[PDB]
Amino acid sequence: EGCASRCMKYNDELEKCEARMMSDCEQELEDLLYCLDHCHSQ
Amino acid sequence: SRLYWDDLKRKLSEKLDSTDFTSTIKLLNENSYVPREAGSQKDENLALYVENQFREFKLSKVWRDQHFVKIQVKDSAQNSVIIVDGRLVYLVENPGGYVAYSKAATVTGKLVHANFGTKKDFEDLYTPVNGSIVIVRAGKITFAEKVANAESLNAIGVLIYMDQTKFPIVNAELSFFGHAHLGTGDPYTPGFPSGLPNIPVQTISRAAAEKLFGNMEGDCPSDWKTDSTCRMVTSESKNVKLTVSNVLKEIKILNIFGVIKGFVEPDHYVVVGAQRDAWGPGAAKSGVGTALLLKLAQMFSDMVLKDGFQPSRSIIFASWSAGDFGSVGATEWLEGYLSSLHLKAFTYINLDKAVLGTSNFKVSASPLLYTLIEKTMQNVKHPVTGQFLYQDSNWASKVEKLTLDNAAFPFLAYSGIPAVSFCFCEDTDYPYLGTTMDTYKELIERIPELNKVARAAAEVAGQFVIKLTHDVELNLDYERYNSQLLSFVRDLNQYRADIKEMGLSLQWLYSARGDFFRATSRLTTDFGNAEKTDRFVMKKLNDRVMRVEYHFLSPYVSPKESPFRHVFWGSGSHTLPALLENLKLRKGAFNETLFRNQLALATWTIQGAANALSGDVWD
Ligand SMILES: *[C@@H]1O[C@H](CO)[C@@H](O)[C@H](O)[C@H]1NC(C)=O
Ligand SMILES: *[C@@H]1O[C@H](CO)[C@@H](O)[C@H](O)[C@H]1NC(C)=O
């Protein structure tokens, strides 16, 4: 699996939170970013 | 026997072990090839030498690419720096070097020190620089940026020198060269038979600077960490007169090319390049790169003809001229293939200044190349310690972006081709760059294991090439842009309240980020599922990956007005950092009209990059 699939759950949580927030998502972003930056595809 | 990565890696390493890089560097310091300013007889002699070597190596094809370009050079009248004390006037120096693209002019006024000439350096001075000449230290930023920063504050000229603390050179009288174009390529020549300075700018020796400081008052701040002789402002009784008379001259430059054709997809290429020209002897500046280029071409050609290496894609070796003037030779080549080069060349590897020391290994690149760099670091040893280069798993979050003086910059920011530059270096700058002391003698004295360090720089570049050309798949890491986009959205998200106040919403930018995310995932899945032996499936997928970098070039600006169109790595009001720099002002230097357009155009560019990652229209 690539990094985007490994980190997909965190992307979904961010989008779900952005969607709530438009009717602060800083943690949901920090989590995704962490997962992306620590993922090594190879 | 079909060769696999392990076999190729071990073959390269074998060939490198017997390679003599220092003999070639030394040959390029012989009298027939120094000095070698662009368009000179000696530059040309070296070009034709490189050409004939490429032929000797039996490359698939070898060719010349010529351009006529206008450079600036010294006039027959000497440039000068003079102290005016009226009742007396005396010469400080007739400098041996110059700064190309200086305005030709004579100015007189106060002299004011501005440290390195950064924007913050100027902000912290107690003396307004308007209507004054400014003196700055070389370093930290380019000459072009120093001049632009001074001009922005209405300075009337700029002097540039090398202080002993940052540039510990025994000879205080040493001259030096650079250029002050805030761009690349030839800024002059119209489209029938621009980042230029409107003030004079001139390099002076340390000795000259010290004579100036003897006419100046005020200690320099200790946090500048410069010499004790440095002073801040001319005395009231004294002014400085700078006279620059540089002239334009048309020259013919030759870029020399050689290719090893790919066995499967010869129409796609990795391009490996090095600057050939230099003011003065240019050992570190041009010699080392050119030596690397020669040895890499020879070794790869031998691997193909003798050892069974069958690269799927082509490998192009490029010896550029007029690099010293702002990557002019390389830029002119790029410009000939506006809009289409990214469909052919999929990566650029710069070899310039790859060996400046031993302590550190540094790399700057498009994020598309980060996985390739990481895997390469895992497989190359440091040339002094013996440790593998990969000793920081968080390296990629620390990389600095390519700068305007690096020949890899226009490939990425203008042409949309993923590019990489790397070096073994120190924390300190190499002191002799741009001087007559940039010789093989000085280089070998500072780095007595120059041959082993050059071997390591060759191994890095060689491994990049093999990885990029061996398999049916392209080793380009498009998913690395998910982190880059997310990081931007994080920076933008600090101004959420400003954005609400203006009646705007980030929904469509968020949504475009998510679209790119899912679109990279889908492309990765498709690679995973593809029949790797089907040359037709793989060519289609790889063609897609080759367009990823290009789709981050803004389609909304002219490359004649803003050549550096890449929204991450480029320059001007269409970049993502520029959007943040404007929005930062709202706490009327802030322009709301500009910001609205910037948000719209960024969002359209990111969304269009996501859509472009889909295969067919019905997907
Ligand atoms: C710099 O600008 C100030 C303020 O406008 C002006 O009074 C002064 O004469 C200028 N200095 C010089 C040296 O031109
Ligand atoms: C603000 O930006 C708009 C659009 O680029 C431009 O037309 C206008 O001149 C700018 N205003 C100022 C004061 O710079």
CATH number at residue B541: 1.20.930.40
Q: Name residues whose C-beta falls within 8 Å of residue B191's C-beta, 6 or more positions apart in sequence.
A: none
Question: Distance between CA B268 and CA B359 in Å, rounded?
Answer: 36
Listed as own residue / partner, the contacts of B76-79 with beta carbons closer than 8 Å and 24 or more positions apart are B77/B245, B78/B245, B79/B202, B79/B243, B79/B244, B79/B245, B79/B246
Are the beta carbons of B44 and B33 closer than 8 angstroms? no
Q: Which of B223, B244, B265 is the last residue of a domain?
A: B244
Cα distance between residue B134 and residue B414, in whole Å: 32
Ligand 1: centre distance to CA B132 (Å): 9
Full residue range of the structural domain in which residue A18 is found: 1-42
- Ranges assigned E (strand) in B168-276: 178-179, 201-203, 216-219, 231-234, 239-244, 247-260, 265-275
Q: Yes or no: say if B552 and B416 are a contact pair by the CB < 8 Å rule.
A: yes
Cα(B220)–Cα(B226) distance, integer angstroms = 8
Domain identity same for B355 and B404: yes
Q: Which positions ≥6 away from A1 have C-beta within 8 Å?
A: none
3-class secondary structure, B206: helix
Q: SS3 of B104, please?
A: coil
SS3 at position B275:
strand
Interface A-B: count of C-beta contacts within 8 A: 59
Q: Which CATH number is B229's domain given?
A: 3.50.30.30
Same structural domain, B312 and B439: yes
Residues B222, B270 share a domain? no
Q: At what angle do helices B535-545 and B507-529 cross, to 10 degrees?
A: 150
Report the gap between the CA of B517 and the closest CA in chain A (Å).
7
Resolution as reported, in Å: 1.9
For residue B473, which phi and psi values (nearest 5 degrees)? -90, 145
Method of structure determination:
X-ray
SS3 B407: coil
CA distance B145 to B101: 13
Taking alpha carbons only, the member of B226, B270, B253 closest to residue B113 is B226
Q: How far apart are CA B177 and CA B198, in angstroms?
A: 19
Which of B586, B593, B596, B598 for a ligand 2 pocket mutation test, highest count of atoms within 8 Å of Cβ? B593
CA dihedral B333, B336, B341, B344 (to 10 degrees): -80
- Residue B133 has phi, psi (to 5 degrees) of -85, 140
Q: How many domains does chain B fold into?
A: 3
Nearest ligand (C-alpha, residue B132): 1
Give the burial class of B196: count Cβ atoms within 10 A of its Cβ; 0-12 exposed, 13-18 middle, 19 or more buried: middle
Strands (E), B163-212: 178-179, 201-203
Both B315 and B460 in one domain: the answer is: yes
Nearest chain A residue to B371, by CA: A42
B455 touches B383 (CB < 8 A): yes
Residues B411 and B518 in one domain: no
**Chain B residues within 8 angstroms (CB to CB) of chain A:** 371, 374-375, 393-394, 396-397, 477, 479, 482-483, 486-487, 489-490, 493, 496, 505, 507, 510, 514, 517-518, 520-521, 524-525
Same domain, B111 and B225: yes
Domain match, B91 and B158 both: yes
Q: Which amino acid is at B567?
A: V
Task: Specify the number of domains making up chain A.
Answer: 1
For the stretch B242-267, what's the b/e string if a residue is b when 16 or more beta carbons lie within 10 angstroms of its beta carbon? bbbbbeeeebebbbbbbbbbbeebee
State how far the Cα of B527 lies from the Cα of B143, in Å rounded to an integer: 45
Domain of B502, in residue numbers: 481-619
CB B413 within 8 A of CB B565: yes
Chain A contacts to B (CB-CB under 8 A): 2-5, 7-8, 11, 15, 18, 22, 24-26, 29, 32-33, 36-38, 40-42
Neighbours of B77 (CB within 10 A): 12
| Of B465, B480, B495, the domain-final residue | B480
Identity of the residue in A11, A25, A42 whose CB atom sits nearest the CB atom of B517: A11
Q: Do B41 and B97 fall into the same domain? A: no
B153 and B174 inside one domain = yes
The Cα B119–Cα B121 span in angstroms is 5
Domain check: are B472 and B485 in the same one? no
Whether residue B466 sits in one domain with residue B488 = no
